[PDB]
Amino acid sequence: ADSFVVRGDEVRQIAPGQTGKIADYNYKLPDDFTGCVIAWNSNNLDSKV
Amino acid sequence: FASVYAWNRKRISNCVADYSVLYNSTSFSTFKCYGVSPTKLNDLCFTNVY
Numbered sequence: 001a002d003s004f005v006v007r008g009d010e011v012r013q014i015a016p017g018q019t020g021k022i023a024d025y026n027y028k029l030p031d032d033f034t035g036c037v038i039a040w041n042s043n044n045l046d047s048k049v
Numbered sequence: 050f051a052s053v054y055a056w057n058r059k060r061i062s063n064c065v066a067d068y069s070v071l072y073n074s075t076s077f078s079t080f081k082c083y084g085v086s087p088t089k090l091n092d093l094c095f096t097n098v099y
């Protein structure tokens with residue numbers, strides 16, 4: 001299980017074959033990756049005034 | 050920008066498509082490609098970009 005926190009617009013980059021800023025410099029998946037990807041909003045936990 | 054019923058078309062030529070300078074300014078919610086994989090964009094040269 002690999003866990004992290006990313007912006008809501010960059011959730012689409014956590015997929016095989018994607019490109020962008022997260023997929024190029026931060027976290028990249030293999031082309032023959034097997035397994036699942038789960039992502040949920042946490043605005044009431046990781047954000048503060 | 051232009052309205053959707055009067056969408057603006059612009060020709061692009063004689064340039065180098067780096068697209069890494071957009072990482073600081075804007076974040077794209079939708080980005081799809083048809084006929085070419087996104088990871089192969091840095092290894093290609095195009096003919097008429099519109």
Ligand SMILES: *[C@@H]1O[C@H](CO)[C@@H](O)[C@H](O)[C@H]1NC(C)=O
Pocket residue numbers: 073074
């Ligand atoms: C662009 O990057 C600089 C530092 O590299 C940063 O201070 C600035 O906020 C960035 N631009 C935007 C619109 O966030």
